[PDB]
Design a protein around this ligand. Structure first.
Ligand SMILES: *[C@@H]1O[C@H](CO)[C@@H](O[C@@H]2O[C@H](CO)[C@@H](O)[C@H](O)[C@H]2NC(C)=O)[C@H](O)[C@H]1NC(C)=O
Ligand SMILES: *[C@@H]1O[C@H](CO)[C@@H](O[C@@H]2O[C@H](CO)[C@@H](O)[C@H](O)[C@H]2NC(C)=O)[C@H](O)[C@H]1NC(C)=O
Ligand SMILES: *[C@@H]1O[C@H](CO)[C@@H](O[C@@H]2O[C@H](CO)[C@@H](O)[C@H](O)[C@H]2NC(C)=O)[C@H](O)[C@H]1NC(C)=O
Ligand SMILES: *[C@@H]1O[C@H](CO)[C@@H](O[C@@H]2O[C@H](CO)[C@@H](O)[C@H](O)[C@H]2NC(C)=O)[C@H](O)[C@H]1NC(C)=O
Ligand SMILES: *[C@@H]1O[C@H](CO)[C@@H](O[C@@H]2O[C@H](CO)[C@@H](O)[C@H](O)[C@H]2NC(C)=O)[C@H](O)[C@H]1NC(C)=O
Ligand SMILES: *[C@@H]1O[C@H](CO)[C@@H](O)[C@H](O)[C@H]1NC(C)=O
Ligand SMILES: *[C@@H]1O[C@H](CO)[C@@H](O)[C@H](O)[C@H]1NC(C)=O
Ligand SMILES: *[C@@H]1O[C@H](CO)[C@@H](O)[C@H](O)[C@H]1NC(C)=O
Ligand SMILES: *[C@@H]1O[C@H](CO)[C@@H](O)[C@H](O)[C@H]1NC(C)=O
Ligand SMILES: *[C@@H]1O[C@H](CO)[C@@H](O)[C@H](O)[C@H]1NC(C)=O
Ligand SMILES: *[C@@H]1O[C@H](CO)[C@@H](O)[C@H](O)[C@H]1NC(C)=O
Ligand SMILES: *[C@@H]1O[C@H](CO)[C@@H](O)[C@H](O)[C@H]1NC(C)=O
Lengths: 238, 366, 86, 99, 35, 49, 50, 34
């Protein structure tokens, strides 16, 4: 139940500085007052990050997705290869109540959307879903910015999340904050592309970065919270 | 002991080091999570139909209690062999992410299921990693998978550009260009279908009867435990040198309440050099603490076999609270170097004959 | 090497006597350290004491002489040296 | 009292000793070619016939590391003894008499 | 080479010769007072 | 010991940190040599002629 | 089997390198003692009369 | 800059001569002024 959207909305492919964001806890081992060096997938410091002011973007190996969303317009994510019933597809949606995670051979048209009426109930994102794989429900994830890291390693989908109030207007804050592990999904999908969901009114700023394998040095404080990090290959001083 | 260590029947005056003292563990404790649901294993093992070798069936099982004794002792299986774990220890370990893969092959292809194995099924249909850990089961299915009319539903991949990566699935069925010209969906010369069928018949002899093969693959300490074997958990003991078996992680030490501030997603902390310090019991979720049981070398002070035959014994760096063969022999003195038994403390001060340490030393009078 | 394991101890037992020499070397090192300190500091036979009245022709030695007020009975410079190094 | 870095030698000796101890204790976390770095797990997971091979690998690695540590200790102790002899001679010749 | 390298000394031969020259000139002209 | 081979480096990597110590020792030796020369020769504050 | 052969080569070459380093350490200590003696001789017999 | 010890980048070369604080080699060394 969807139609081709005549209004070809255009979001300029802005480029900005990544600064020092995109650090997550690599494991579950508590440490205190120690400097630990580890090699893993991470977003390189001071990289070039793409800002959209809803096309198809390749998944690559890892995705750092950030949104300074106001009033929770961002809804969910779509993952797959061709986004049709021919191949397994993954869908995450954060509706008014507890979230939904569903893996099926979902059929998508050009411009899927959720829409709302002014009681609030409208769901015609897809057209068909014949064979499903996994179903999961948990607490809803949702001026205030939300950062997510998606990793698909060894049949495990790791989602690291962190939300923080922001008072700066447009640019990314120049600060440091770790990303605690939120969700582990024990389902393996050969993803290559992903989409985005918007809460259109039936009656737009986000940042995308990619991960690379490199070595970091992390400092643990007394309570076990990461407070400082260094990239190994950024500068002779580093 | 001094005579034995010095290999001499006479010993001159001085202090010598014989052996080392250490506290012994008293009892054992087991702490396993509140899980008792049975694990469905016969559903995948006693299933009526199994998928083809090129489309082998895969299942993931978790949040269950599985007994491997009932699978090992059964003689219905033709081949039972494991790689990473001895079968008798399987019941004693707790794993996560158990994978069961089921498929059907021929009699002569059973050798193909092995790390670093070269053949046809091992590299064109199913590839096993070199560092695979787990176990493999096989059995005969002639009485059920063989039809007098001939079974051709069982097919295997025969043609591909290259070999298959381990744990990689292939379902694509496209014509193979065996020459230098495109086939364009024509199966003529230098064009063969990638799939080859089977001729399973009851009259066929050994080496061609249908065989059903399943594999079991595990992981080693990558996440909190979810599937264990049949075990019983005991309670907790505080301030006691005991050996613990927390969630399959085994150690020895003394358990004390700790004031460390974890976060709701860790399981066990540490300090440095892979030294586990604090753990969280699955049943109670308490921040415990681990401290090694005390030890240290022992020394004997003697004035020489020429003079007498009485000695003093020093335990180095040990609190004079847990001394014990000679515990109730004489007075006990507490020093900065440890505890000393067999000598008397005096308020005088003479020259030093046999240095002990921390600025104090002993002599013979007693 | 073994960390309280019987099998490791049994396997190590057949490597000959390597550990006796290892322990004997460290014991020699420790005894040598004690001898070094004793022979560098114990240079006199008696313990001398300064007179209660200190009139050394105008020279002032108060900074180096021990201070009885401090429990350690150490001088000013000794305290500075001990505090400076970690 | 004010100027720092006036006691380099003693601090260097302490740092060297601590670093040697630290690396010696840290070498315990290496596979040395076996399948694991903890001996309890290989005891509790696998049967004796090749478990003993695994402990052989662990044993040879750890023994070699211990030998290297002992040799370094001997060298450093010899150097310290030479310095102590010099200190004793200086103290005898310059404190107990005019040189 | 096969991973082996040689590092030149910090003090060149000319500076060493100059040190020796200074020492010898001092010990010739001023005697031992310059020490 | 590997001569620019990736698999050799990976196999060597599981032997712990033997090579950091070996590299440290040689640098210590070199610094010692420079100090030896400097202390034996540089004993004049000025340069005379 | 390449792991086996590489392991044998690695252990041999590592052992040889360790032997070389130890010999170098001993020789360096001896040379240091000689240099200290030379420095004392320069200090005493050149800057004054002995 | 090119020196008997190799190639140096990020440091200026001057005609002056000061006391040596960060040794480089071949009789030259660098210091912070840049
Ligand atoms: C938001 O999504 C949840 C699913 O998590 C919806 O809850 C479902 O509601 C239907 C209708 O009664 C039930 O049959 C399902 O059992 C519910 N699911 C769960 C997990 O409880 C909820 O209705 C959605 N809200 C909307 C669309 O406004
Ligand atoms: C880390 O934990 C410690 C101990 O709980 C915290 O120290 C105290 O925390 C309480 C409550 O947060 C405050 O009321 C006290 O003022 C803190 N004492 C101090 C700061 O000396 C500490 O706040 C925690 N966080 C950090 C960053 O150390
Ligand atoms: C699958 O079916 C077999 C029978 O073909 C089951 O094996 C029997 O199990 C019972 C358990 O009480 C024993 O008393 C019988 O002696 C067994 N017979 C044989 C021939 O093995 C088996 O338990 C079933 N489930 C599995 C294998 O998971
Ligand atoms: C040996 O253990 C005893 C028992 O803990 C120690 O005595 C305690 O000392 C602490 C610190 O002075 C006190 O707070 C406790 O009240 C003492 N307990 C008892 C029962 O006396 C003793 O100090 C230990 N000895 C050494 C050398 O550490
Ligand atoms: C020797 O020097 C010490 C320096 O500490 C003198 O002690 C100081 O004397 C002055 C003058 O009375 C006081 O104001 C300071 O408070 C003293 N300092 C300390 C640390 O006590 C001492 O007086 C000198 N000796 C003589 C004989 O003058
Ligand atoms: C990112 O790339 C754009 C061009 O693609 C460039 O103009 C911009 O300067 C880059 N950003 C940074 C921080 O280099
Ligand atoms: C994943 O999908 C892409 C196409 O989106 C395909 O080229 C690739 O071979 C697939 N990989 C696997 C392992 O299936
Ligand atoms: C969904 O499953 C059915 C049942 O076998 C199958 O017939 C159908 O082809 C599947 N759908 C797709 C898109 O493969
Ligand atoms: C496990 O069960 C015991 C007994 O019913 C209970 O006291 C304990 O709280 C339970 N623990 C968890 C984590 O559910
Ligand atoms: C020590 O041995 C000598 C020689 O046998 C003997 O004369 C002497 O009495 C002995 N001393 C004591 C205290 O027995
Ligand atoms: C003398 O020794 C006794 C024990 O023999 C002890 O109780 C007492 O406190 C000591 N007195 C002094 C002044 O050292
Ligand atoms: C100073 O350095 C420059 C740079 O090469 C050179 O051309 C000039 O001759 C030098 N002058 C002196 C006096 O050394």
């Amino acid at each position: 139940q969807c139609v081709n959207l005549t209004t070809r909305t255009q979001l300029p492919p802005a480029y900005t500085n990544s600064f020092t964001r995109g650090v997550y806890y690599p494991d579950k081992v508590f440490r205190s007052s120690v400097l630990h060096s580890t090699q893993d997938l991470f977003l390189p410091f001071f990289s070039n990050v793409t800002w959209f002011h809803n096309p198809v973007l390749p998944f690559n190996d890892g995705v750092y997705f950030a949104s300074t969303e106001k009033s929770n317009i961002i809804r969910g994510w779509i993952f797959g290869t061709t986004l049709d019933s021919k191949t397994q597809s993954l869908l995450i949606v954060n509706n008014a109540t507890n979230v939904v995670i569903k893996v099926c051979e979902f059929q998508f048209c050009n411009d899927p959307f959720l829409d709302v009426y002014y009681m609030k109930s409208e769901f015609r994102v897809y057209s068909s879903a014949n064979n499903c794989t996994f179903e999961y429900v948990s607490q809803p994830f949702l001026k205030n910015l939300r950062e997510f890291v998606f990793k698909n390693i060894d049949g495990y989908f790791k989602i690291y999340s962190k939300h923080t109030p922001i008072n700066l207007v447009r640019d990314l804050p120049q600060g440091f904050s770790a990303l605690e592990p939120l969700v582990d999904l024990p389902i393996g999908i050969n993803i290559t592309r992903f989409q985005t969901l918007l809460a259109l009114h039936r009656s737009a700023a986000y940042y995308v970065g990619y991960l690379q394998p490199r070595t970091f040095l992390l400092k643990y404080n007394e309570n076990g919270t990461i407070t400082d990090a260094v990239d190994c290959a950024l500068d002779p001083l580093s | 002991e001094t005579k034995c260590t010095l290999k001499s029947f006479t010993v001159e005056k001085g202090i010598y080091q014989t052996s080392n003292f250490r506290v012994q563990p008293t009892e054992s404790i087991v702490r396993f999570p509140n899980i008792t649901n049975l694990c469905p294993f016969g559903e995948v093992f006693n299933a009526t139909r199994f998928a083809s070798v090129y489309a082998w069936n895969r299942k993931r099982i978790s949040n269950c209690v599985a007994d491997y004794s009932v699978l090992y002792n059964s003689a219905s299986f033709s081949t039972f062999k494991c790689y990473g774990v001895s079968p008798t220890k399987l019941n004693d370990l707790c794993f996560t992410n158990v994978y069961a893969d089921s498929f059907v092959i021929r009699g002569d292809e059973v050798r193909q299921i092995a790390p670093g194995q070269t053949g046809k099924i091992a590299d064109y249909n199913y590839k096993l990693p070199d560092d695979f850990t787990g176990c493999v089961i096989a059995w005969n299915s002639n009485n059920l998978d063989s039809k007098v009319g001939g079974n051709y539903n069982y097919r295997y991949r025969l043609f591909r550009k290259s070999n298959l990566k381990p744990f990689e699935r292939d379902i694509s069925t496209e014509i193979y260009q065996a020459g230098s010209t495109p086939c364009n969906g024509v199966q003529g010369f230098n064009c063969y279908f990638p799939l080859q069928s089977y001729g399973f018949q009851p009259t066929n002899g050994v080496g061609y009867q249908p065989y059903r093969v399943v594999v079991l693959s595990f992981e080693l300490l990558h996440a909190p435990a979810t599937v264990c074997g049949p075990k019983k958990s005991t309670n907790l003991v505080k301030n006691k040198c005991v050996n613990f078996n927390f969630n399959g992680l085994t150690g020895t030490g003394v358990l004390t309440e700790s004031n460390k501030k974890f976060l709701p997603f860790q399981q066990f902390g540490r300090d440095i050099a892979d030294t586990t310090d604090a753990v969280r019991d699955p049943q109670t979720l308490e921040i415990l603490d681990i401290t090694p049981c005390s030890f240290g070398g022992v020394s004997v002070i003697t004035p020489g076999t020429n003079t007498s035959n009485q000695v003093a014994v020093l335990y180095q760096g040990v609190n004079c609270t847990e001394v014990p063969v000679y515990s109730t022999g004489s007075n006990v003195f507490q020093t900065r170097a440890g505890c000393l038994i067999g000598a008397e403390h005096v308020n005088n001060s003479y020259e030093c004959d046999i240095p002990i340490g921390a600025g104090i030393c002993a002599s013979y009078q007693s | 090497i073994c960390g309280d394991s019987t099998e490791c101890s049994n396997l190590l037992l057949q490597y000959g006597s390597f550990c006796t020499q290892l322990n004997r070397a460290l014991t020699g090192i420790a005894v040598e350290q004690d001898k070094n300190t004793q022979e560098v500091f114990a240079q006199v036979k008696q313990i001398y004491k300064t007179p209660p009245i200190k009139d050394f022709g105008g020279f002032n030695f108060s900074q180096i002489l021990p201070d009885p007020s401090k429990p350690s009975k150490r001088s000013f410079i000794e305290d500075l040296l001990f505090n400076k190094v970690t | 009292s004010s100027t720092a870095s006036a006691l380099g030698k003693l601090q260097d000796v302490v740092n060297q000793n601590a670093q040697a101890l630290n690396t010696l204790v840290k070498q315990l976390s290496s596979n040395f070619g076996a399948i694991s770095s903890v001996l309890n797990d290989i005891l509790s997971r696998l049967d004796p016939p090749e478990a003993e091979v695994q402990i052989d690998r662990l044993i040879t690695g750890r023994l070699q590391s211990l030998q290297t540590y002992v040799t370094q200790q001997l060298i450093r102790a010899a150097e310290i003894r030479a310095s102590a002899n010099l200190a004793a001679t200086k103290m005898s010749e310059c404190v107990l008499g005019q040189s | 080479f096969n991973g082996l390298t040689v590092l030149p000394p910090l003090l060149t031969d000319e500076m060493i010769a100059q040190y020796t020259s200074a020492l010898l000139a001092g010990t010739i002209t001023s005697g031992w007072t310059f020490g």
